[PDB]
């Protein structure tokens, strides 16, 4: 019997609403729910929660037509959320989760307060960029005082701002945000090796690389997304060029086959010698990026490596050894990158294969991660049954339930031709208001 995609979408929505009810009951205004114990935890600043999961959920709720829930969340933000806090926030996570989550909720609703708050937060983050003579952000900033800490940063944490900051520039009229984000990316691109790669680790004050490892994976990942995304969102010609050049260099020097499967291990950024054998589950975003930049066959080949992991292990292992294709770790982070890739590739030509694969992933999530008050990360994927930890990461609220719903629902609330998603799946273009 053919899959009833609309029924599956309705199931995703039902499960999301059920999870939201758990959040309201156990973690209202708090950063994350721990859905096994039915408690909450902080994310950015211990003991000074910022409603993280609530903010992350907002655009998802609106897209699903969970309007009462959306408005309850928006109304909480408007009454309660502020960033004048004497504590250190990680600049990267704060931008993609809170600035981006407020922006997508603003674009869905039109509510000016959500933009005001996004902009206030971005101005606090800007101090981290201003503290570097290169415009490379320090990793942490005190939200009240502007004091910075830890300049030993990485491509992802210097280069995952241009989508949110560029949208701020469009909405506010002030070019400073776009300019600040782009300058940091240009810094590392200008320091590409002769083979077109950047090392993943960089110092905000010296402006120099602090390792020799080029990566598509953790430390680097979303830098490469945001090059393409800035072309798509802003028509930036430099970013269009850079996106394709960077991916070309990765395909030339990092694409390696092991046991017939495509992987992208770390390599020396100048010599191309392989320098690692690990691949994170988090690398699966790259299958979608490959399609976006005009390398779809390569993207499908890379997706197939993760499809192998899903078919073999049920849940994709958090990290694997590329030389054996086996897990390196047994726990998980309830990770969204497989349906991320499926949605991004499906947006190209609507091939139902991607729906098939994402449905496996959703059903596996239901079979493994469901807990009393929501969905949780896993302790051990190798035992039967798989054992659970006790945490619903904030990104779950923005990412995989949205990906599944967008893949299955054909919702009239999104213009699928104009849809743009941040690395946190915040919708930054494509809302069709009712
Ligand atoms: Ca991401
Ligand atoms: Ca992306
Ligand atoms: Na969101």
TrEMBL record:
Annotated Gene Ontology cellular component terms: membrane
Binding residues for Ca(2+) 2: 423
Location within or outside the cell: Endoplasmic reticulum
Residues reported in the UniProt entry to bind Ca(2+) 1: 225
Gene Ontology MF terms in the entry: calcium ion binding; mannosyl-oligosaccharide 1,2-alpha-mannosidase activity
Gene Ontology biological process terms in this record: carbohydrate metabolic process; endoplasmic reticulum mannose trimming
EC number annotated for this UniProt entry: 3.2.1.113
Keyword annotations from UniProtKB, A to Z: Calcium, Endoplasmic reticulum, Glycoprotein, Glycosidase, Hydrolase, Metal-binding, Signal
Primary localization class, coarse: endoplasmic reticulum
First-tier enzyme category under EC: hydrolase
Family assignment from sequence similarity: Belongs to the glycosyl hydrolase 47 family.
UniProt name for this protein: Mannosyl-oligosaccharide 1,2-alpha-mannosidase
Provenance organism: Caulobacter sp. (strain K31)
